[PDB]
Every structure is written in structure tokens, then in C-alpha cells.
Design a protein around this motif. Structure first.
Motif, PDB file in Angstrom:
ATOM      1  N   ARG A   3     -18.599   5.873  31.636  1.00 19.29           N
ATOM      2  CA  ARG A   3     -17.529   6.030  30.962  1.00 19.29           C
ATOM      3  C   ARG A   3     -16.824   4.584  30.706  1.00 19.29           C
ATOM      4  NH1 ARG A   3     -14.881   5.275  27.891  1.00 19.29           N
ATOM      5  NH2 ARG A   3     -13.194   6.333  26.859  1.00 19.29           N
ATOM      6  N   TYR A  54     -10.395   8.186  27.657  1.00 21.96           N
ATOM      7  CA  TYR A  54     -11.498   8.578  28.216  1.00 21.96           C
ATOM      8  C   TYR A  54     -12.200   9.816  27.324  1.00 21.96           C
ATOM      9  CZ  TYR A  54     -10.892   5.687  32.102  1.00 21.96           C
ATOM     10  OH  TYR A  54     -10.557   4.528  32.781  1.00 21.96           O
ATOM     11  N   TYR A  70     -20.614   5.652  24.882  1.00 21.84           N
ATOM     12  CA  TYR A  70     -20.425   5.282  26.197  1.00 21.84           C
ATOM     13  C   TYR A  70     -21.581   5.098  26.992  1.00 21.84           C
ATOM     14  CZ  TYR A  70     -15.591   7.123  24.905  1.00 21.84           C
ATOM     15  OH  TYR A  70     -14.608   7.210  24.422  1.00 21.84           O
TER      16      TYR A  70
END
Lengths: 130, 198, 122, 87
Positions: free
Chosen positions: A68, A19, A64
Motif C-alpha cells: 500500500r 489508503y 499501488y
RNA sequence: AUACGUAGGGUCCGAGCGUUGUCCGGAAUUACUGGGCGUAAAGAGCUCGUAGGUGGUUUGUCGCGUUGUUCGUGAAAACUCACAGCUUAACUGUGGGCGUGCGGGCGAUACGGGCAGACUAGAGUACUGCAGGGGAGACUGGAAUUCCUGGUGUAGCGGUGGAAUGCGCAGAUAUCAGGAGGAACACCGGUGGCGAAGGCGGGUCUCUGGGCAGUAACUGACGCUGAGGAGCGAAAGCGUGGGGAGCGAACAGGAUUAGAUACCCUGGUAGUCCACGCCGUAAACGGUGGGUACUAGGUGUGGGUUUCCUUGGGAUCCGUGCCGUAGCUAA
């Protein structure tokens, strides 16, 4: 230490999967052009190269969307050391059945599946991302 | 699953909409060891679906086979799932897993037919598939195979997804190959809609 | 797994797991039978099955079963042994064809009528 | 061990020039003299059995640098070889 | 007994129909495609390194690898596509594709690789300190045990669930003092360190092992792995000469017991210790090979240095635990 490009792709995979919205890298021209074409087709946001330890460094922003979620679906070097891979003009593999894109380091430089098919030279494919 | 064909003078039989094809793969007898004894229950895995394609999976752990079937059916109604495809093909070859069970799926020439294992045949044909190729390996089982079927199916998406991810449209995303396949799919759908309009 | 190490060596199958051992993978052999004493099958399948030990022409001494109810073979017989698989008996993987070289077909066999050497009823 | 003064004078002697510690000849000389030092420590500690591993590691590093000396220029390789009397 | 055997009665196939023998796939059941090695099969006990594979950043060359292209080329039948015929079919003919190749000329220079190199991030060397049970060697200590020596001083001591083996009563136990002996270092002594692993701890001295930390000072890719091969390598055991206080296999009596050979006691030989050797196996296990680049944390904890309050706190790099993200596992 044996393989730099595999570590390139592994860092992209982990950083996108974990992430993170950015990744930093030494700037050898190979990975430079890999991320260059990556943003060219838009699986990442934007790459910028500046000065670092004796060489330079490329910093990559991963694209993105509304959440996310990563435009990258995955990364895997294929023509790895010990199993380097060559391909020709006709049997140019179609990534994800043709959905995705690939890297093919042609004698004329660097091209993907569709570009090389439109042109017709081969010799060395690399990772593909879809 | 005994004596299900009955014609009585009672009220009704609980018919509804959603003319869904149902299937049951297997039930294994389940043994609870009470102190000096064995209680026996049933475990049903129910897969419901539609010829349009949308699928549901349910799991009835009930000591009665009809109760297990009903529980699986209603869990599949609770636990539905949608699949995108191309006419009677798959949009792209995929692989799915359930912890030991591996399933490979692949598009086939139109009219090739659903060539799949016993469990996979059911999990597929409940959807809108008519012609794809598939196989499975590992797990030496069926529950995990069925579970991995939906896992593979989940990896399915339209070319619009990769088009938005790349920002770039189809082409590289959807090349002529699939382009013409989805054109055939949508043209057949439009012709069917026009025919059903009148 | 170390592609170069594969080039060095590797990739052989496990084991043949041979089944037939009369000789030549013969669809049948012929030989002399002896030791036609009946032995015991497995305990759950309590019965007694009639067998024999045949020295085939293949110069190997194997164990053959006598299928059916009645038998015609005795000592010094030109019995034709075929391969078989009898899990009911230990180390018995052969039979003798009825209605053949030596052993007459099983009398009045009618459910099979091809096995057990039962010719056509006139 | 390689005393801070003997290694420095050795670097001055056989090193390519001043301050060029770590040059292949320099390290060769340093480790060579360290090996000569341990040669007799082992001969009196006949059952040391523990410094011999460092002996072998330094020998291997000396050879691993000797090969780099030879590949860059055989001339310097021969020069140092007959300078130190190796083989 | 719808499983046997018998009858119908049914399934299917048909001049056939079943049985045996063999091969391929199913098998992913050699996992190139397309496998794994903590607990299921699977990391040698551990090091280095030959062969081999294998590669940092960057400049130009070569175009061997590699690809692009032209042509020779790959018999017919093969096999297939297409056409025709064999009464149909089988079958044959016709032409294509096909014959995936090799070889020759021509090209490409992205990449590997070769050549010429170059650079310091990699690696390796210095400087300055940090932890010490890293090892070896030489010196020493007394506790303590037993034996021996002089006492005082008793009929008991030790033995065990109890006993009886054993001894004392001569002075045993004991007490004090002394001497001899041989072995080991309690407390410190623990996620705490060290060591490649087996392993390391009383103290001194000598030699020596390696690691971590801050300056690039420097070398200028000197990297890693590593089959063969190399040594090291627990204990035991044996070769050679000593030791032996004790323990102590083996072997001795007594004791439970039907049986003791066993548990228990009553002793003690090799060994156990040393010196020089042998061997190489241990459950020689993170049951997790070596090395390298990324992935929330939190918290103990060894060495260091710095940075921030007035020691206090932070950072950093290395060692070492537990829990817990992602993700992974059959769990």
C-alpha cells in the motif's frame, strides 16, 4: 463554494493518503484531463467516466505497487483563484528539480514542463505531482 | 571529554572497522530535583557517519559525559540511516522538520562546498556530502535542528523510485540535468573502482 | 493571507529601534560638561564610576561616561562626546574621548595604548 | 405566515405561468406579501425585536432576486417594479 | 584575576591599527518568495449587506488578461565576458554580452475574462408534517413572604463560635382565619431542545421568528465573503413617572480586632420591578470568523422519515456529547 479544482486535488490527496484505492468525482472536463494526464504519466492506476447526477462522474484508481504505497507523492494547485499563475517558454519550472511532472495549460492546450520545453509556448501552469 | 590522550601499558583501546567520522553537537546539564537537592546528569547527541554517506544518530542520557558519549555512539550504531546523493550534491532539493526546526537542502555546482550551519555542517559532512547548499530556521534550538536534518535526508531517493512509481523510466523522472550529474557521479565511482582494482 | 487584502494594505516593518540621539548620527559631538558627580553602578558590580552630563553642540543634554582611571575635564570644558553603551549604569550611553579636545588621555594607560588617550611612550 | 392558499393565488396572479413557483417574479411576490404581512405585526408587536431579522433576511433575498430579474431582462424587471409599486 | 592594572609571553594586522556614526544582510525581525492568530502577539459581542474580491456544468464567438513571434527599442560609461595596454597592480582603452523594459506588426484560443447563450447538482421557491422555554403583546393563578385585621395564647423571640445590637412582655415568637402588598415561578428543570449572540423556562389566548425532514413541483448560477455602513445587543448606571412586599448598594448601631470602616448580627435609601428612553461596554470564549469540497471508528443523544423481524431491528437527513483513526500541535 469557490474553487472546484482545488477540491479535486484535496480529495485526491486525502483519498490517497487515507489508503483508499479509489476516488469518485464530478466530471468537469478540467479535472477529467488532469486525471487523464495523471494516468498518462502513471501516478495513478486508471480513470473511467460514467453517468451520475445530471453531469457525469469520473472514478480514479490510484496505482499501488507491491504494498500500500502510492505512486503519487503529493498534490498542490498553484495557479489558484486570487493568485492565478502564468509562465513562459524559457523559465518552465522543473518539478522536484525536474524529477516530477507538472500541468501547464498552454495556448495549444495542456502540456507539462518537458513537453512545453520541447515545444516552447507558455501562459498558464497548474499543480505539479512528483 | 578530559584527559583522552593516554599512552599506557594496558591491553588495547577498542579499535574496530567502520572507520566512521564521529561528531557530538552539544550536551546540556540535566537537573533532577530530589527532595531538597539537585542531581546533575548529561545529555549527549552523537552523530556518526561515513564518507560513503551512511549516517547514524544516537542519544546518550547519562550522568557522565563519557558514558553519554558512548551511549550516543552505540545508539547511532543501533539507529543508522542511509542517504542517496549525486556525486557531491543532493539528488533534489528537500525540506525536513522536527516539530519546530526546519531545514532546506539544495544541490550545488560541483565543488561549491557544504555551506551549512554548525550543527548541519556536522550532520552533513559525516555523510558523503562535499558540495551542497543548505540552511535552517525556527525552533531556536539544536536538538530539533539535528533531528530535522535526518528528517530532510529521509526524503531522498534515486530516480529509480519515481521511475517505478510512474512505470515510465527516467527522462521525465531523471532529465538530462540530473542524468549527466549522476553519470558523472557513477563514472567517477567506476574510475575509482578501476584504479583500486590494481 | 488574503492576497487581495495585501493589495488593500499591509507589509510594513515593525519599529526603527533608534540608538543614537546626540544628533545627525554624529561620530562625535563636542560641548560643555557639568554635573560630573559620580553615581552608583549595579549592585552585583559594586564600584563607583565617574560620569558627567554634557550639553553638546547638538543642543541636546546627554549623559557621558569618563573612561579610564584619571580625568582632566572639569566644569566649562570643551569635551568631545562619542556614543557608547554602558549596561553597568542606568541611562548612560555616551563617553568622552581622551587625548582630544579637552580631556587629557588616561595617565600611563598601557594595555590599550590607543584608547584612553595614551600617546606613544617615547 | 404565507398561508398555503394566499401564496397559491399570488403565484397564479403574478407568476410567469402555472406551477412555476420559484420563478423570480413568483418568489418576489410571495416574499413581498409576506413582508407586507409582517409590516403590521411589527407595528403592534413594537418590541418584537426577533421577527425583524427574518424581515431583513427576506428583504435581502427579494433584492438578491430582483438583481437577477434585472440582469436577465430589464423589461420583466420594470414590469414587476411598477406592478408592485416598489420605489 | 590568564577578565581588572602591570610585566613578559603569545594571537593577529601593518603604515597602518583600533574607536565612533550610518546602511544592508544575518532576522523568516512584515513571512510574495518566506509568519502566524484555542493555551505564547492576534476572530471585533452577534447579525445583513454597499464597495470590493470572488466563483457551478456546458455550446459557439472575441483574444482584453495571458502566452508565441518579428522588428524599433533600452546613450556612453554602468556591470560582466573577452582582448590589449598602464613596470605589476591599481587604472585606461576595445569590442561583446548586457541594457531584463516599453512600443508596433504578426499568432495562439488551454485558462481567466467579455459577448451570445443553454442546464440543474449550487442557490432560491412549493407541497406535506416534525421540536418549542424563539420573541413580543393581552389575561389569569396561588404558594410564599411581609405588613395589616380578628382571635387564642404565652416571656420570649430572632441574633451568633458566643455575644450585643433589635423587639416583646401592651401580647412580640407562635397557631388559625382573613385582608393587603410586590416579586418570582420550586418540582418538570437535562448534552434536552429552542435562539445570530446577548438569552428562553407557572398556565391561557393572539400575532409572529426560524430550522429539519420526504416530491422536484418550479426558478435556472439568482453562490460566498464581506471593508465602509446598518441595527440588535448582559448587567450596571443616568433622563423622565410609578411601584417597593422583600432584598439592598451608599449610609446606620452593635461584634472579633490595635484599629471596623470588614467578614457577624441588628435596619434601610437609590437601585433592584414596570413604561418610554439613553449608553454599548462583560471572562459579550469551541478562548477555535463566515462559507464550501475530502479524512478509521465506536458510543451516548433531540427531530424526522423511510427499510428490514414480529412493538423488535436497519438506513437516511438534520441537532447535540464523549472517547478514539489518520493526520496535526511545543506540548
Amino acid at each position: 463554494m469557490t474553487d472546484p479544482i482545488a477540491d479535486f486535488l484535496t480529495r485526491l490527496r486525502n483519498a490517497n493518503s487515507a489508503y483508499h484505492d479509489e476516488v469518485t468525482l464530478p466530471h468537469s472536463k478540467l479535472k477529467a484531463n488532469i486525471a487523464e494526464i495523471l494516468k498518462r504519466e502513471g501516478y495513478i492506476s486508471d480513470y473511467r467516466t460514467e453517468d451520475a447526477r445530471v453531469g457525469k462522474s469520473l472514478v480514479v484508481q490510484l496505482k499501488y505497487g507491491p504494498s500500500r504505497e502510492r505512486s503519487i507523492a503529493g498534490l498542490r494547485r498553484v495557479s489558484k483563484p486570487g493568485l492565478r499563475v502564468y509562465a513562459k517558454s524559457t523559465n518552465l519550472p522543473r518539478v522536484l528539480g525536474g524529477l516530477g511532472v507538472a500541468i501547464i495549460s498552454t495556448s495549444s492546450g495542456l502540456l507539462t514542463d518537458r513537453q512545453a520545453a520541447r515545444q516552447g509556448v507558455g501562459g498558464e501552469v497548474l499543480a505539479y505531482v512528483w | 571529554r578530559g584527559r583522552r590522550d593516554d599512552r599506557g601499558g594496558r591491553g588495547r583501546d577498542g579499535g574496530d572497522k567502520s572507520n566512521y567520522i564521529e561528531r557530538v553537537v552539544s550536551i546540556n546539564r540535566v537537573s533532577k530535583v530530589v527532595k531538597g537537592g539537585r542531581r546533575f546528569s548529561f545529555t549527549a547527541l552523537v552523530i556518526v557517519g561515513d564518507g560513503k554517506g551512511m549516517v547514524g544518530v544516537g542519544y546518550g542520557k547519562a550522568k557522565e559525559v563519557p558514558a553519554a558519549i558512548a551511549k550516543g555512539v552505540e545508539e547511532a550504531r543501533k539507529n543508522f540511516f542511509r542517504v542517496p546523493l549525486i556525486g557531491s550534491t543532493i539528488t533534489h532539493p528537500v525540506q525536513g522538520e522536527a516539530a519546530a526546526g526546519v531545514v532546506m537542502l539544495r544541490p550545488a555546482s560541483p565543488g561549491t562546498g557544504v555551506i551549512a550551519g554548525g550543527a548541519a555542517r556536522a550532520v552533513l559532512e559525516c555523510a558523503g556530502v562535499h558540495d551542497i547548499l543548505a540552511k535552517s530556521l525556527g525552533s531556536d534550538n539544536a536538538i530539533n535542528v539535528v533531528h530535522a536534518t535526518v528528517a530532510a535526508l529521509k526524503l531522498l531517493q534515486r530516480p529509480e523510485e519515481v521511475a517505478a512509481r510512474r512505470g515510465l523510466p527516467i527522462e521525465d523522472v531523471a532529465p538530462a540535468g540530473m542524468l549527466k550529474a549522476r553519470r558523472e557521479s557513477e563514472a567517477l565511482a567506476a574510475a575509482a573502482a578501476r584504479e583500486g582494482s590494481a | 493571507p488574503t492576497i487581495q487584502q495585501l493589495v488593500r494594505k499591509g507589509r510594513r516593518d515593525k519599529i526603527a529601534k533608534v540608538k543614537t540621539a546626540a544628533l545627525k548620527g554624529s561620530p562625535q559631538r563636542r560641548g560643555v560638561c557639568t554635573r560630573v558627580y559620580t553615581t552608583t553602578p549595579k549592585k552585583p558590580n559594586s564600584a563607583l564610576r565617574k560620569v558627567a552630563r554634557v550639553k553638546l553642540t547638538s543642543q541636546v543634554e546627554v549623559t557621558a561616561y569618563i573612561p579610564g582611571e584619571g580625568h582632566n575635564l572639569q566644569e566649562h570644558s570643551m569635551v568631545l562626546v562619542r556614543g557608547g553603551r554602558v549596561k553597568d549604569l542606568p541611562g548612560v550611553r555616551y563617553k568622552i574621548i581622551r587625548g582630544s579636545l579637552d580631556t587629557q588621555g588616561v595617565k600611563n594607560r598601557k594595555q590599550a595604548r590607543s584608547r584612553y588617550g595614551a600617546k606613544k611612550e617615547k | 405566515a404565507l398561508t398555503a392558499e394566499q401564496k397559491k393565488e399570488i403565484l397564479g396572479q403574478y407568476g410567469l405561468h402555472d406551477t412555476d413557483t420559484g420563478s423570480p417574479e413568483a418568489q418576489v411576490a410571495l416574499l413581498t406579501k409576506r413582508i407586507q404581512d409582517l409590516t403590521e405585526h411589527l407595528k403592534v408587536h413594537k418590541h418584537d425585536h426577533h421577527s425583524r431579522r427574518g424581515l431583513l433576511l427576506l428583504v435581502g433575498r427579494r433584492r438578491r432576486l430582483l438583481k437577477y430579474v434585472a440582469q436577465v431582462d430589464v423589461a420583466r424587471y420594470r414590469s414587476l417594479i411598477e406592478r408592485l409599486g416598489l420605489r
